[PDB]
Design a protein around this ligand. Structure first.
Ligand code: NAG
Ligand code: ZN
Length: 1016
């Protein structure tokens, strides 16, 4: 019996939206604890029978790229940290150390000799070195897709299981800029029992500290029962550094960072240095430190206290290891032997802390509050809200989503077969998984790294994309070639991928033209892949060398097609206009491809002398004053010209869209009779303050509300076809395109902020929808959370991550904007949605980057815009913290994130070609996805194993019967199944042995993993 995720409002002790509504967010000087209060404790609270147990947990924050590349940091810092950790922990059996970033650890371990590898395994086995989380990285939680968060977790933990024989059940997230409940969701379904977070709004820290609610059972916003709950520890202070982790007073704590005495080139900003602990000072030093501890202990419910001891790239030098260890050893010996302190202090690990906490809990010493919600948007001080990185480096943000999909497609396409080692499938896939996983780092996708580091991430992702293409194309060739004919060269390109949207038209001329000709090649095979587990029809396009091309399927059935020109926009530095030029030698052919669930479908493009029967040609209308001619070679329809004017378009029986004379949407009419609903696109700009704090890669600090971009009299291009129409306009910084295929329009923005310093470009939608102060944004492409605009907070605080979609609604109408890339956005007034396109910032914003953002490049952002009637929809009550997509909006999101893949046959003739693969695959219910299909065994394994991650979303019931689908049982997708098991999401632990080898489908909002075993 599935939990109902719509109708029952969870009863929880803290609900973060409710908390937000109540809190005053005053930023007052709380004293030595600047954002708290002077903590008082009763010295009689602890005694002989009730001691304070203190765990000091040494750690070292290692960024996989930030100010230096991954390899640069590894060479200069991390390899030394790990080498000296091995030595010092080996030699000092009571010393402890926690490690988070497996990308660095794997890099190090593989360079070790066998002697050292064994020493390393020993200190892990004995508990001295403990892995926390065990992901490839410590990912950003704002921009990251849940699928990639899982990918990187799996990458690190699979490595740890194989080489260290351990799987972390405690998570450590000290650094992501705000925190998402997507983390406890994934972690709890991956065997975790505890997690730790740090970067939350200073006001939230204060509020929760006051109620001792810094430790909580974090459940999902829709979870009535509490089964998703994961124990969470929120750190109470401003930083994870040593001054902000011993207790409330950094002036005191800094004195217990023994790296800060001078020889290391570090010091205490509070002007009192650390002093070496001696017999003459240990009593006084201990009195100071124990007092700090006991103050921190006031903020929590048990007699077990966590004291992290670390900072960025700490525990490098041998001398640093000694200086920290020896001084702390002296403090522990004194403190533990002075009964009057009633403290037992020691080095410990994160798991040890959590174990002792739950022992206190079980002894009836504490009960913990329940909590739901998220921890965006983070501010570490004053009005410095970290909403800028929701948008920074948007090119690579978009790239992340493209690579996300190519990794899935490559792993899925290649999973169907076992491959010979010589094929290098596993090699290429591991590379792709690792480069994407690396980019999930909280300085990767966030766009907060130095210019040369961003370049490194981009290069790595480009290599991953090539790896995916190689795997995908070899897989297509095998799946669609008669087996007795199949003769692979594992280095040969049988197909090239054709991608219409990445890097995108106007970004890179990368697409190949299918060159046909009576005197060279009459025809060309193309293949579409559909990674979704349901039948899909979708328009696909290819470049061809002639407009006289027709399409057939592999049964030679004619397929209706449309040919359009290839239009490119040019900032004409002579006329000072932005205007389109048409190709005279290549054309776009568009047709509907119909592709099996998780399958393949083949089509043939054939040239003729004249207009083919089943091919139509789009009309084109250029709207501008002072037109010049636009010849189009063989294209059979002459371009038409006119003065700027309002226009209306309708494709198929879909919506009718009206545009302004500047080429921007002004209204949508859903059906013939229905109203023309005001929906207006507008481009505006935010600036930067000329006094006080400046915006940078992290911070969004606007100098007031956005000002409209002055548009002049822009050139508007209207293309009208039977299958696809569009309106495109050359705006300053943006070629804005609205594309229509008979349903929700697609929006593409080619964004080039050029040399506009201290500017952020925003795309806004203005409607009449009576949303008031409510809007919805998603978390990690997993769930939609209710947002409430708060005027008591500054503009930038009302910006949230838009990792994949946002909506506003009233009783009757909803507008949903879906994205192909994470960007920052808000609803700043009733009826509005807005989302940032790019930002170019001259100054550094004081968080350590030491540069602005002046490395912008052209990016093609993609969207779907869904206007819907929702009055018949069964929606959550007004008190529910969640929202849910409709079927239409969810399908539009899928179109952006997981489109059909397109393959062009490279050679002249494809001998033994087949028309279809997967025609017999079950077409599963629309709310179910096979998020991951991955073969887990190499070819030499007698028992083959294939892992599946199934995700079921929740779609609103709006009265559409939408019925008759087949049960998807992933365990029978490959033949000769011998066993079927439910696993953790990482595939690392078997949870359930499945009757009849049948994998059940999952509940709405649930995610499960299954592994099928095959004897043949
Ligand atoms: C892996 O750890 C387990 C306990 O979880 C132990 O039984 C097994 O021997 C270990 N594998 C080794 C030491 O190779
Ligand atoms: Zn970091």
């Amino acid at each position: 019996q599935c939990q109902d995720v719509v109708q029952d409002v969870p009863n929880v002790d803290v609900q973060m939206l409710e908390l937000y509504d109540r809190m005053s967010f005053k930023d007052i000087d709380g004293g030595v604890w600047k954002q708290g209060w002077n903590i008082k404790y009763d010295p009689l609270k602890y005694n002989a029978h009730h001691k304070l147990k203190v765990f000091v947990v040494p750690h070292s924050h290692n960024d996989p790229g930030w100010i230096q590349t991954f390899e640069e940091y590894y060479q200069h810092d991390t390899k030394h940290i790990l080498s000296n950790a091995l030595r010092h922990l080996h030699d000092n059996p009571e010393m402890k150390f926690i490690w988070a970033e497996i990308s660095y650890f794997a890099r190090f371990y593989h360079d070790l000799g066998e002697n050292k590898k064994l020493q390393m395994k020993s200190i892990v086995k004995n508990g001295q070195l403990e892995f926390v989380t065990g992901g490839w990285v410590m990912p950003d939680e704002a921009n990251s897709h849940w699928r990639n968060v899982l990918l990187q977790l799996t990458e690190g933990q699979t490595w740890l299981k194989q080489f260290m024989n351990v799987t972390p059940t405690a998570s450590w997230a000290i650094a992501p800029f705000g925190h998402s409940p997507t983390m406890p969701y994934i972690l709890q379904k991956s065997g975790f029992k505890n997690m730790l977070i740090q970067r939350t709004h200073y006001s939230v820290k204060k509020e929760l500290a006051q109620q001792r609610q810094l430790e909580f059972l974090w459940r999902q916003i829709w979870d009535n029962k509490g089964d998703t709950a994961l124990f969470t520890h929120m750190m109470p202070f401003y930083s994870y550094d040593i001054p902000h982790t011993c207790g409330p007073d950094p002036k005191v704590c800094c004195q217990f960072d023994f790296k800060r005495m001078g020889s290391f080139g570090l010091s205490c900003p509070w002007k009192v240095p650390p002093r070496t602990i001696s017999d003459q000072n240990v009593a006084a030093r201990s009195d100071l430190l124990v007092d700090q501890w006991k103050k921190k202990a006031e903020l929590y419910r048990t007699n077990v206290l966590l004291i992290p001891l670390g900072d960025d790239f700490r525990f490098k030098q041998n001398t640093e290891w000694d200086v920290q260890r020896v001084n702390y050893e002296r403090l522990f010996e004194h403190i533990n032997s002075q009964a009057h302190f009633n403290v037992q202090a020691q080095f410990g690990t994160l798991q040890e802390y959590f174990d002792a906490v739950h022992q206190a809990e079980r002894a009836g010493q504490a009960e913990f509050p329940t909590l739901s919600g998220d921890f965006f948007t983070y501010a570490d001080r004053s009005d410095n809200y970290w909403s800028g990185y929701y948008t920074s480096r948007p090119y690579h943000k978009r790239m992340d989503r493209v690579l996300m999909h190519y990794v899935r497609a490559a792993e899925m396409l290649s999973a169907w077969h076992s491959w010979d080692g010589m094929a290098r499938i596993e090699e290429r896939l591991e590379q792709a998984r690792r480069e994407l996983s690396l980019f999930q780092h909280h300085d990767g996708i966030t766009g907060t790294a130095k210019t040369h580091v961003v370049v490194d991430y981009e290069q790595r992702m480009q290599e991953a994309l090539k790896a995916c293409q190689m795997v995908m194309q070899q897989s297509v060739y095998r799946l669609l070639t008669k087996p007795s004919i199949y003769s692979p060269d594992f280095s040969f390109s049988y197909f090239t991928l054709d991608d219409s949207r990445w890097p995108g038209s106007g970004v890179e001329d990368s697409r190949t033209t299918i060159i046909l000709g009576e005197d060279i090649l009459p025809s060309k095979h193309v293949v579409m892949h559909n990674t979704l587990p349901h039948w899909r029809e979708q328009l696909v396009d290819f470049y061809v060398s002639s407009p006289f091309v027709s399409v057939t399927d592999l049964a030679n059935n004619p397929v209706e097609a449309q040919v359009s020109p290839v239009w490119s926009w040019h900032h004409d530095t002579l006329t000072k206009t932005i205007h389109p030029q048409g190709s005279t030698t290549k054309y776009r052919i568009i047709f509907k491809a119909r592709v099996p669930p998780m399958g393949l479908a083949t089509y043939v493009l054939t040239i003729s002398d004249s207009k083919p029967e089943h091919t139509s040609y789009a009309s084109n209308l250029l709207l501008r004053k002072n037109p010049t001619s636009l010849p189009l070679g063989q294209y059979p329809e002459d371009v038409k010209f006119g003065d700027p004017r309002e226009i209306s378009l309708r494709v198929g029986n879909g919506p009718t869209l009206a545009f302004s004379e500047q080429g921007l949407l002004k209204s949508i009419q859903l059906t013939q009779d229905s109203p023309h609903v005001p929906v207006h696109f507008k481009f505006l700009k935010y600036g930067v303050r000329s006094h006080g704090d400046r915006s940078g890669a992290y911070l969004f600090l606007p100098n007031g509300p956005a000002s409209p971009v002055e548009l002049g009299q822009p050139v508007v291009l209207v293309t009208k076809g039977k299958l696809e129409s569009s309106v495109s306009v050359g705006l300053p910084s943006v070629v804005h395109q609205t594309i229509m295929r008979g349903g929700a329009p697609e929006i593409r923005n080619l964004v080039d902020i050029g040399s506009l310093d201290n500017t952020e470009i925003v795309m806004r939608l203005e409607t009449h929808i009576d949303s008031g102060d409510i809007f919805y944004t998603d978390l990690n492409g997993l769930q939609f959370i209710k947002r409430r605009r708060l005027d008591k907070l500054p503009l930038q605080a009302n910006y949230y991550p838009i990792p994949s979609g946002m909506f506003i609604e009233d009783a009757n109408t909803r507008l949903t904007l879906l994205t192909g890339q994470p960007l920052g956005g808000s609803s700043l007034a009733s009826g509005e949605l807005e989302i940032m396109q790019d930002r170019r910032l001259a100054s550094d914003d004081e968080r350590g980057l030491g540069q602005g953002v002046l490395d912008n490049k052209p990016v093609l952002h993609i969207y779907r815009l869904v206007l819907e009637k929702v009055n018949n929809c069964v929606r959550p009550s007004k008190l529910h913290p969640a929202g849910y997509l409709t079927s239409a909006a969810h399908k539009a999101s899928q179109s952006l994130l997981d489109p059909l893949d397109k393959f062009i046959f490279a050679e002249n003739e494809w001998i033994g070609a087949q028309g279809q693969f997967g025609g017999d695959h079950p077409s599963a219910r629309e709310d179910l996805d096979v998020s991951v299909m991955r073969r887990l065994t190499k070819s030499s394994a007698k028992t083959q194993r294939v892992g599946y991650v199934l995700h079921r979303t929740n779609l609103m019931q709006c009265g559409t019967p939408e019925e008759h689908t087949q049960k998807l049982d992933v365990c029978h997708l490959l033949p000769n199944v011998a066993r079927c098991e439910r696993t953790t999401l990482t595939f690392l632990q078997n949870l359930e042995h499945l009757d009849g080898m049948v994998a059940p489908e999952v509940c709405p909002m649930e995610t499960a993993a299954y592994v099928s075993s095959h004897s043949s």
